[PDB]
Design a protein around this ligand. Sequence first.
Ligand SMILES: Cc1cc2nc3c(=O)[nH]c(=O)nc-3n(C[C@H](O)[C@H](O)[C@H](O)COP(=O)(O)OP(=O)(O)OC[C@H]3O[C@@H](n4cnc5c(N)ncnc54)[C@H](O)[C@@H]3O)c2cc1C
Length: 453
Amino acid sequence: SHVPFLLIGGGTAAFAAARSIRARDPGARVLIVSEDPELPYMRPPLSKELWFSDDPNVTKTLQFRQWNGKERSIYFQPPSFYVSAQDLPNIENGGVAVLTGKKVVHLDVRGNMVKLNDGSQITFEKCLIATGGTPRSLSAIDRAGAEVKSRTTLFRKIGDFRALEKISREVKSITVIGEGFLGSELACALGRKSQASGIEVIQLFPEKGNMGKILPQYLSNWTMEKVKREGVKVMPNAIVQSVGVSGGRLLIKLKDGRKVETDHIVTAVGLEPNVELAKTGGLEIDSDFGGFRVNAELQARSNIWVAGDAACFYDIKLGRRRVEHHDHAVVSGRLAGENMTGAAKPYWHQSMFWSDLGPDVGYEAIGLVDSSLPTVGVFAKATAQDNPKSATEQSGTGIRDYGKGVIFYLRDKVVVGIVLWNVFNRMPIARKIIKDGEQHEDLNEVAKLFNIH
Ligand SMILES: Cc1cc2nc3c(=O)[nH]c(=O)nc-3n(C[C@H](O)[C@H](O)[C@H](O)COP(=O)(O)OP(=O)(O)OC[C@H]3O[C@@H](n4cnc5c(N)ncnc54)[C@H](O)[C@@H]3O)c2cc1C
């Protein structure tokens, strides 16, 4: 068979593309192809809102409670929206179908055709690659035995949540490895769970403080203290020597002489993009940043675009980049869909990131953020509406004595990245400040733009 629009991967970016195509051309035939057996679902609530629900059948519905009491589904759309695969070419002025449980194992660029794992062959006219990425495993655990790995989770797709949620009510001690935002989002999840279950939740990492690769020492620490406060044993400066089983329990040997005894391990340590198809089709990978190299219009070659986590693209303001955001998967995927219908537009939009550690703490981020860069923070006492619960009350979604502040990351006294600590709805102002990029003289005056005095 054949289809005029072929989206590889069933992701957040892959969906955003199909919506944007069918908006510009209301009769288009679109076929997503998913390795995953499940239909397009957003990822963020897997580590946050789905733990803070009181329905014990949430595991089955996947209907979450936002911080404002509202309900929502993890699935982007119901299965009524989508049409069937077999009847897509035939159904007249038809919609958008998806082919679950099938992996695209070869790309023939000059043939405008792909092969699937089962031997199938689909030709196409326009094609998107939106494969996302594979979770990294810890080199300590790679070396360890077979018995050791059977108690080690990675976190990404739903099954990983269902797995760990069951494990949560079964054992006494669970250890989270990684200082990243996901690592911490998960620690605070088990933390609230621990207030009733009385289990042991440990977060350990080689870094000095929580999110210490991005946040400056003052806030990185404050956050370490805030995560502790939520019922967690935080262990900074932990370099894992070796891991093994002994006496029905895992034992983590640290390089600094300490030893940890626990029942289960979750590894939250970054993302390896799925550039597996780059060989067979002969497309270019970026050796620095990783992923598929594409231009400012997200194009790899004639008839092939790439978006989401998997896309190393060219921002003209900031330079060549690659980002693993949700907002990015959405906006990039949407643009790529416009270009597949001829719009030939550049990626002028600046993607944004957010995180929530309970409904009492929240971070917003845009641009180039890094602890290594020189940093200026401006802080002030937080008020009643400065928290993610109170902000969700207002719009109520998934982002369409100091308590709050702003952090400028800079290079030549001109701002190139921004982090916001419990300051909400002021993202459009941060976007303006990066795009403009002037020689700001007093960053105290710039902070007044985020209501910081
Ligand atoms: C727990 C969690 C929490 C997160 N929280 C936040 C947050 O708070 N804020 C934020 O901005 N971002 C967050 N993210 C990031 C966001 O979910 C990702 O950036 C988003 O999933 C990217 O969309 P994507 O389509 O590019 O990748 P994905 O959504 O991973 O989609 C890729 C899909 O394509 C499939 N695929 C891959 N290769 C093939 C192939 N060869 N053939 C067929 N199918 C294939 C994969 O199986 C996968 O299902 C979070 C992610 C996770 C996992």
